[PDB]
Amino acid sequence: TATYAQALQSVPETQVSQLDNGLRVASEQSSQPTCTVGVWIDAGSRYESEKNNGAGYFVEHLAFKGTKNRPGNALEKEVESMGAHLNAYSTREHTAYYIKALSKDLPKAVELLADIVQNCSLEDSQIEKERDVILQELQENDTSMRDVVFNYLHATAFQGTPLAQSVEGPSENVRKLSRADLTEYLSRHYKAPRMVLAAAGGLEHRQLLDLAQKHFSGLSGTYDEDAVPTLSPCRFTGSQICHREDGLPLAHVAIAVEGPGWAHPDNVALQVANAIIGHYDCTYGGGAHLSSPLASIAATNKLCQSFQTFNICYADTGLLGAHFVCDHMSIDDMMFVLQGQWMRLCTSATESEVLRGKNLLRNALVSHLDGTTPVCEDIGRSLLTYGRRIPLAEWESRIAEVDARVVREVCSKYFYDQCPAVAGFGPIEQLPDYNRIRSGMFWLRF
Amino acid sequence: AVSASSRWLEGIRKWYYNAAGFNKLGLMRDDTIHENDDVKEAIRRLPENLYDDRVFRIKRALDLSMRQQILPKEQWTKYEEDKSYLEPYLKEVIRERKEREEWAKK
Amino acid sequence: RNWVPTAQLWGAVGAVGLVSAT
Amino acid sequence: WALVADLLTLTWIGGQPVEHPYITIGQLASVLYFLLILVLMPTAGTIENKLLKW
Amino acid sequence: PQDLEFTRLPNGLVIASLENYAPASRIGLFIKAGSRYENSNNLGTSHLLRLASSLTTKGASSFKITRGIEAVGGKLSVTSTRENMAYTVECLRDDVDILMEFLLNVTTAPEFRRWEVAALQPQLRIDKAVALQNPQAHVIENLHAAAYRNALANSLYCPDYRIGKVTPVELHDYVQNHFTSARMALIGLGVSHPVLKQVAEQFLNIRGGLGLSGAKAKYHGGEIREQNGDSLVHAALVAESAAIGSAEANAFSVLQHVLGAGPHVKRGSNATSSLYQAVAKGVHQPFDVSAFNASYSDSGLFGFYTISQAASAGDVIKAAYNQVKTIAQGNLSNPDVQAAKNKLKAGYLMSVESSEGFLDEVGSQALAAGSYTPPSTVLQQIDAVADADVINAAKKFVSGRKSMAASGNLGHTPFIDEL
Amino acid sequence: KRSVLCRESLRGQAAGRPLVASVSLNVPASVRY
Amino acid sequence: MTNIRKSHPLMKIVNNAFIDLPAPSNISSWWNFGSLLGICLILQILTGLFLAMHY
Amino acid sequence: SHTDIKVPDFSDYRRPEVLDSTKSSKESSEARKGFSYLVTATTTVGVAY
Ligand code: HEM
User: Fold this and answer.
1) Which of A92, A225, F14, G40 has the smallest count of CB within 10 Å of its CB?
2) Pick the CATH number of B1-106 from 3.30.360.10, 1.10.1090.10, 3.40.50.1820, 1.10.760.10
3) Does residue G48 line the site of ligand 1, with CB under 6 A?
4) Which residues face E299 on adjacent strands?
């Protein structure tokens, strides 16, 4: 026999370790076959200037196409013949490259990764070949309402800030982008301490630490002169951006109220809140009996196609809200239920309801961690986000302090009397007037 | 301990059944029900036969009412034939909703 | 829940309203 | 029907000298009316429902 | 710490268990009903069955079921394939019991009520529509009905004409015949085997032989072609693979990988993939292609899949063939087989590196074999494949009845006689 | 509908035990290989 | 629709509660008191206005 | 293509308290709602008279 709590405390702790330059080493052991080693660099889109707005994202197309040591397709051939997978993901705050690989393959794994980060053989040919590709990706991203809309959100809740730029970047910055510019970018932002070398699975921390090729370090200050925040707050703005295209079959709406940085007691309590509203799709098997009202109403009244609440967490900024796709004629009704669910939440939460969401949270936050890749990303990202802690067993505790009154008071900071960030890609003809969505965040009636 | 008393209610019951005139109209007890939200759902749950039946019965009945005519003595609903066909359906609908209510306490 | 404290300030408003207004 | 006829009975009192005869009558009619409406009928309802086995 | 623990009962249902360390436990009753178990008159019934998991049952009302799992944050997945039907059930260590009693009602006590089943009906369309958004599904489906005649040729989604016609006695019958003891295999990822068994013993003892649906296999070459307006065209070319868990099969798998083009690198192109190289050279700039490999109990399907544009369809399609002919002509050097192998081996291990993966792998094995083969052993078998063996298999696609399925503008898609 | 214009296409089906496995779950829903 | 007087004017549609409306078959004489009720309201009024024309 | 979008310069229309491209509006806007709601409460209080 064994009980949830117990299991919790029994989980392999994460070992954080440092090289001389600030290279961060972490790892969670299991003595299992496969391993996912990763280098989680934290110089994202938000450091880009208007020109290099898509810089980083451009580097990512070159990351895997050559090192001075390993030319044209020498990287791929190497990974492949091992049976290892190599992925590169980029965010507005975090770039990361990782490898999935047999545990015995660390040797040439970690070498590869390291190599990748540092030496990237980038010829004029590869630059002009990537351009064309990027320009073609851009065109394809315009084919995705959800991606089109979420960008919009950011741009309008971040209007007038570095953070509001697409990670994909400006069309024509791809055309223009000087070859010299990727260098300065990399050179200036890939310098650890930023970087973290993380990993999970069957490895021994001891060896990870050692294996780390100590080749280049943080060429930066020893004092406060550096302390000028490169992470300077980004002004919060509640505006809407309404891009109406009656040509399109459905309507995407992303509505948000600015939120806490990555670390904050209010930041877990929020989650528990969204557990309650939940998320819903044409294909949920419960429909009408699902315990979250927006879902039930939706399910019942054919109100919407799909809807999800989110919590986007940045160091100085946060996007909170949900997002619903709904026929041209149902934009207002779903707005009404949603906002309605928010207000009800900060005034009438009931312990039952908050206790169910609570438990949902736990699961969402345990199940994610199933698999090697998962764990690795939590460990890597966790270190630039929340610093060098791994709050995994704490969570249950913190999640445990949750009370219906805690949930209520935390939700009221952020939603109540606050000014929304709303964007849509019409049929938005029926989308509520900004003032109407505004007055939706306080309770006279409705 | 009901042997004499409860074997005599049937006597008032029987009396009462034919007292209320709906007997005469060709209608049955279940078709006299107050159509509310539970009945409604039960209703919807009826098979084509049961359910079309309840439509003709009420058709024939409201026709009679409109003409103030009673059905012939030979064609009347006999108490011994109490099709409580809605009852089964109607119970559950309630049963479901009582549960729903209860599950919503805390 | 929040209804008592809100019903109590709605209570108060009516009262002060009458009192004053009347 | 009785309520209706109680109502008629009450209407009669209305044009009556307010003296013993009428007083005593009205008083029991005014209780009858509220019984018919508040207490009798409601019970009768139940009963009938129980005789039908409803 | 403790390794799994299979146990065949008198009924013939398998059951396994692994008390893991971590917080999350997941049961999953795999019943042996796939799509292949329906007839002309019963097609589309598993589909509906799959979608009707949250309906009232004998001990738990659709409302309690759903609200109950929600209560605790549980998930109930009901997955099926042409051969099997895994009924997954995730939740927190402490709540397995509340959850298990749910899985048991859903599966042994379904009550398909005319009214409930009826309101579902329309869901089938909605589900079919959303899965038919990926060319892969309609082609891959078209493939199976062309290549088979009778059993596996049945598709996973209900046929448009059947939708509302799925009747409650159908559902009841399907459960009764197929959702039985001999065809079942319990599987726990965080439960006690001792306590698992007890439960298994108490709730999973029902009788029902195989093939009351009409079991049997058969391969028939055939072509299903679906014209579209889309620039891109997808087509599949496939010959009777070797069967499930047999040497020939295994060989196929290794061969598959020598050509098999499932990118292992983001934004990266395969250097390893022969198909891709060969195709690539004779092909245009934009295109993509990959080795297809399917294996079932009584038959398989091996061959490739292409995605070309209108005019390039043939060029790519033949190109790919020609290259696989090369291996069948004998031309295949040792260095590439070993790479392949290692590719495969690495994949199978990552496949099982997750709870969900492991749980599937295990149940899967319990319906085929009757026990759990450990990884290592697995790994050994794949290694035993001879460099020749691979060639030999390959020889079989080129010299095995063809069966193709395509979609899009088919001006330039080879027919059977074309290649 | 998502535009499939470039080199990015990398969809073709072939897994170990599972092949064309369609999920329907009370919460999520999908199509794999 | 074209030249369906009733729904042409929107106003005249609102009057089709009298003409086109679903009315039960069976129906005691008792229900005529609704209508008469209105009748009386209109008569008092016409009458009132004339009396209040000399009162 | 939908990335060369910019939200237009609002600097003329916004205000003192929340004009700071690089600083928080949360610890600014607490008052800003007060002052607007203040106006409302006054009007509704005079009108009441
Ligand atoms: C149903 C609504 C009304 C009812 C029940 C009603 C009833 C009465 C009654 C009972 C009287 C006393 C007459 C008597 O016994 O001498 C009266 C008088 C009067 N009513 Fe009406 N009335 C109604 C509407 C109106 C309207 C609409 C008007 C004006 C447009 C009006 C104007 C008058 C006038 C001027 C008198 C005074 C002269 C008289 O005694 O005839 N009434 N009303």
Assistant:
1) A225
2) 1.10.1090.10
3) yes
4) E296
